[PDB]
Every structure is written in C-alpha cells, then in structure tokens.
UniProtKB/Swiss-Prot annotation, chains A, C, E, F:
Annotated function: Non-specific DNA-binding protein that plays key roles in mitotic nuclear reassembly, chromatin organization, DNA damage response, gene expression and intrinsic immunity against foreign DNA. Contains two non-specific double-stranded DNA (dsDNA)-binding sites which promote DNA cross-bridging. Plays a key role in nuclear membrane reformation at the end of mitosis by driving formation of a single nucleus in a spindle-independent manner.
Organism of provenance: Homo sapiens (Human)
Keyword Phosphoprotein (UniProt): yes
Phosphoserine sites (modified residues): S3
Gene name tied to this protein: BANF1
Effect of G26Q: Reduces binding to dsDNA
Outcome when changing K17A: No effect on histone H1/H3 binding
Protein name: Barrier-to-autointegration factor
UniProtKB/Swiss-Prot annotation, chains B, D:
Tissues expressing this chain: In the arteries, prelamin-A/C accumulation is not observed in young healthy vessels but is prevalent in medial vascular smooth muscle cells (VSMCs) from aged individuals and in atherosclerotic lesions, where it often colocalizes with senescent and degenerate VSMCs. Prelamin-A/C expression increases with age and disease. In normal aging, the accumulation of prelamin-A/C is caused in part by the down-regulation of ZMPSTE24/FACE1 in response to oxidative stress.
Quaternary assembly: Homodimer of lamin A and lamin C. Lamin dimers then assemble into dimeric head-to-tail polymers. Ultimately, two head-to-tail polymers assemble laterally into a protofilament with a uniformly shaped rod of 3.5 nm in diameter. Interacts with lamin-associated polypeptides IA, IB and TMPO-alpha, RB1 and with emerin. Interacts with SREBF1, SREBF2, SUN2 and TMEM43. Interacts with TMEM201. Proteolytically processed isoform A interacts with NARF. Interacts with SUN1. Interacts with MLIP. Interacts with DMPK; may regulate nuclear envelope stability.
UniProt name for this protein: Prelamin-A/C
Disease: Emery-Dreifuss muscular dystrophy 2, autosomal dominant: A form of Emery-Dreifuss muscular dystrophy, a degenerative myopathy characterized by weakness and atrophy of muscle without involvement of the nervous system, early contractures of the elbows, Achilles tendons and spine, and cardiomyopathy associated with cardiac conduction defects.
UniProt feature coiled coil, ranges: none
Stretches assigned to the LTD domain: 1-118
Species, as recorded: Homo sapiens
Modified residues annotated as Phosphoserine in this record: S2, S4, S31, S36, S106, S119
Taxonomic superkingdom: Eukaryota
Gene: LMNA
Resulting phenotype, R55Q: In FPLD2; interacts with itself and with wild-type LMNA and LMNB1; no decrease in the stability compared with wild-type
Length: 88, 119, 88, 119, 88, 88
C-alpha cells in the first residue's frame, strides 16, 4: 500500500526535505516541481494546504506540474495527507 | 525566562522539562499507561553545538504519570531508576539560544520534542 | 516582544485554528480574511508558503486582503514565520 | 542623616548601599561563594512613587565579596560588568522620604532589602 | 505539597494581609478568627510566637478559634512557619 | 533621645535574639521574664502583637510580669513599635 519512501517521510517531520523526498516521486518529477518553484517539500505541502488537502485537485495539479502519472500523484497525495494528519 | 518553549509529542511520553543550563533532561509519561523506553535515545541539540545522544537501557519502562530525569555528569545527582538517571558520560546537556531536546524511540523515530529558543 | 496570542499560536501546531487565531488578527481582520476566501489559518499559511515565507509579500497581501496596518501585518508574519521555524 | 536604614537579607547578596539621589544602587555578594544573578530583578519603591524594576541579564554572576553597582542614566557612569552596571533605561532611581529597595531573584523572590526612612 | 496562595504569602512579607490571606483559610475561617479578634495575619503570627511554633498547639488552637480542620490547620501552620523561617 | 542598643535592635530583624536583646531589658528583668517563660524577644513581640500594640496594656502587663517602671517599659514599647514599623 505504502512505499518505503512514504514510510520514511511520514514517520518524521518533513523539515526541509526536497520535493524528491516524497514517495513515488522520481528525480525527473522532483526536478520539474523544483523548476516550477516548488523546490522543497514544505512548499509542496503549502500548495497541498492551498488545495485544502483535495485528492483530485492535488493529483491533477501534480500531473500538470511535473508529469506525474496516476500512481505517482496518488502516492504523493497519500504521503502529504498522512504527514498532515500526523503532524499538522 | 527569555526562552520560548516549543514542544511536540506523538507518544505516551512528552518532554516535561529541559534544563536551560544543561544539568538534566526531564520527561513525563503523560498518558495512563506505562511506556517502555528501552533502547530509546535522547538527542540534544544546543543551537549549533554537536548533538548530544543519550541512549536508554534496553529494558527501561516509564510508568504512567511519573517523571524521569536524565541528569548530566555535572548535575551531581544520584541515579535512581527509573525516576532518576545520571548521564555521567556527558558533563552537561548544553546551553545556548536554541536548546532542543528530541525524544527518539528505540525504532529511531522522534516521538517527543521540546525546544528552548532565545532571541 | 511577542503578544500572548502569538506565543499561544507558536507553542502548539495550528491544526484547524481559524484565521482569527493569528496574532494581530482579531474578529474584524479575521472575518475579512475569511470573506476573501482564506477562511482558515492554514489556508493563509499555504498562501504564506506560496509566497516563500516572504515578509513583504505576506504583509502587503494581508494589508490589501483585510486592511491590517503595519503592526497587524507584521505580527501576523512574525507568528507564521516563528511557527514555521518551530514545527516546519 | 535623618534617613533611618533598615536592612534584611537572607541570601548571599545584601543591599550594600542606596543612593539617596537615585544615581546608583550598590550591592555586595556578602558571602564567600560566587552568586549567580541571571535574570534577577531589582524592585525599587520611592514613597508613593511607582515601583522601578531593573532586570539583570539572563546570565549574570556576582563573585564572592564583589560589589555590583547598578547605576542610573542620570548618574552618567559607564557600566563595568559585573562590577558596574548603568541602567541607562532609568534616568534616576528616585528620591523621597520612603526609599525602599528589594532584590528579586530569577524566581521573583525577595531575599535582600534596605529601606531609607526620613522624618 | 504547597498551594499557590501559600507560596504567595511566603514569597512576600505579610505586611498588612488580612487573616483570610493565610493558607488554608477560607472566608468562613477568617471571619471566625476576626470574630475572635484575630482580624489580621500579624495577630495570628504573634499568637504563633506565643505558641512558640508548636504544630500541635497552633493547629489545635486554630481549630478551637475558627473550626479549622486538619487540612486547614496544617496549611495555616505550614504557611506561618515557612514565613517565619524566611523572614523572622 | 534613643538608646544605642535600641537602635541596634531596630536596625536589624530580631531573628533569634533573646529577650535581653530588647531595649530597656537588663539581666534582672530579662531573667524575670525568662522565668515567667519569655526567654526570647520574638515571643515577647508576639505577645505585643496579641496586645494589639497598645502602650498601656503592654507596659502594664510587662510591669506585672517582671516589674519594669514606666521608664524601661516605655523604652521597650518604643523599641518594639519601631521594629514592627521597620520589619512588620
């Protein structure tokens, strides 16, 4: 259900992790997200909160922002939502 | 006190008190159940000073509502487990405008934290 | 130095606090912000993170979004920045 | 002098001297051990005038037998820590027939006092 | 072990505190002591000096003078003794 | 004007000074009061506190308890009053 990268990210506060630290996010996807301006995981979660934790909005936004597929966008949404529910 | 205290805790033990002079680190089982702190680690960061890591004994359990105080070597206290432990290996937990004490479980995960911040 | 409201907001994670929980943001300013759409404090923070935690961006945007003076906008930015330092 | 002086002190620092013109407040660590006065306060009452409170730095130490003299801004003195401090924030410690000074520790507790009472 | 009001009395000289200001003294107990003539804390401390700091004597006398129970008498005696040790 | 021993007693808290330390109290009258039970200055002051600072009552009682004249009784009354003004 959850990748090891997801477990690593969720188990601890994000701090200043790069966007690539998110599970299911390849170097290409993280690099694209950094190019768009989301150069850290914290800015990504700020956008996620701007999307008000919406799954469809977040997944579509990730797909249009770094070319993330259904799998990658779903994994990233799950990771961010779990981190919010654990720490936020 | 000139030190804003910022705490976050995800387990049965929260960081009850952190000594500003670094004499001790005090924790409490703020739950209604005993928490086994066996092999747990206390990672103390004093601003930019090197992290101070204290490891609990492998079979160490903190009873609910009780207080565990890990004194430093310079604190001069006497070890009285599980209530009082003396970190004679470390002279002091440290001082500085950024005193953060993070409680790390035996699984290498932070479950409690307390940060002392001075402008 | 700090308002008691600011210290209370800083000490703990925001969770689901309203925008009125922000330091220097009372009933009038918080109500105006909720009317503007930033109905929640974490929405305002996501705006703040999108602004890359910029003091000038956040404060000027707050001033034009509710009408806060330099005092209230400065207090709000300080509260958000200090919370980001503490938990983020 | 017509200014009756009445002192009570239970700690290591006693109220050594009070300036009737409010230029300075002079204290001495009347013990043979170093006294730490970090974050300590001085609460000064001048008859019916509002209380004046000066706060020591977060870490401040007056050694055994040493004298710390807290000067007012109007005294014009230069601070020589930990021996001389000039409370530039206060022009003068005040004047009046009822001059009472109490030393307040970091815990907000009075341990030393000297009052000047004039007919 | 100690109440906040007890520390408040201990932390400062009694001065002219009313009899009810003593630790463990409710309005009824202080009222009874005023009826007996012990209308101020200094009179009670003078009695304590005459009682020569005997716990049993002072607590029994207080119980006879305002009906103070074991708890109230213990609190008042401890407060007076601590004040005397700190100031006297 | 004032006796020097009186000034010395009033300058400092009585602490654990014996009754003899009180102004106007010599070996004779002091020993009289000690045999009466007044071995210490603070118990005597507590009696003075109970006597509610009345000059006539306290001095008459002292004359009945040891035998001081109006002179020594007046000296002790003044010393106790000044000490109370200084430290009570």
């Amino acid at each position: 259900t959850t990748s090891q990268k997801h477990r690593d990210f969720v188990a601890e506060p994000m701090g200043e992790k790069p966007v690539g630290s998110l599970a299911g996010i390849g170097e290409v996807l993280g690099k694209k997200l950094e190019e768009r301006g989301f150069d850290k995981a914290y800015v990504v979660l700020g956008q996620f909160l701007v999307l008000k934790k919406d799954e469809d909005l977040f997944r579509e936004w990730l797909k249009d922002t770094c070319g993330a597929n259904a799998k990658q966008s779903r994994d990233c949404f799950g990771c961010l939502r779990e981190w919010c529910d654990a720490f936020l | 006190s000139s030190f804003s205290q910022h705490a976050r805790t995800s387990g049965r033990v929260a960081v009850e008190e952190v000594d500003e002079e670094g004499k001790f680190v005090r924790l409490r089982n703020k739950s209604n159940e005993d928490q086994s702190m066996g092999n747990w680690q206390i990672k103390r960061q004093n601003g930019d000073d090197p992290l101070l890591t204290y490891r609990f004994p492998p079979k160490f359990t903190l009873k609910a509502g009780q207080v565990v105080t890990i004194w430093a070597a310079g604190a001069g206290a006497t070890h009285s487990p599980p209530t009082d432990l003396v970190w004679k290996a470390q002279n002091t937990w440290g001082c500085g405008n950024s005193l953060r004490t993070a409680l790390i479980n035996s699984t290498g995960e932070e479950v409690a934290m307390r940060k002392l911040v001075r402008s």
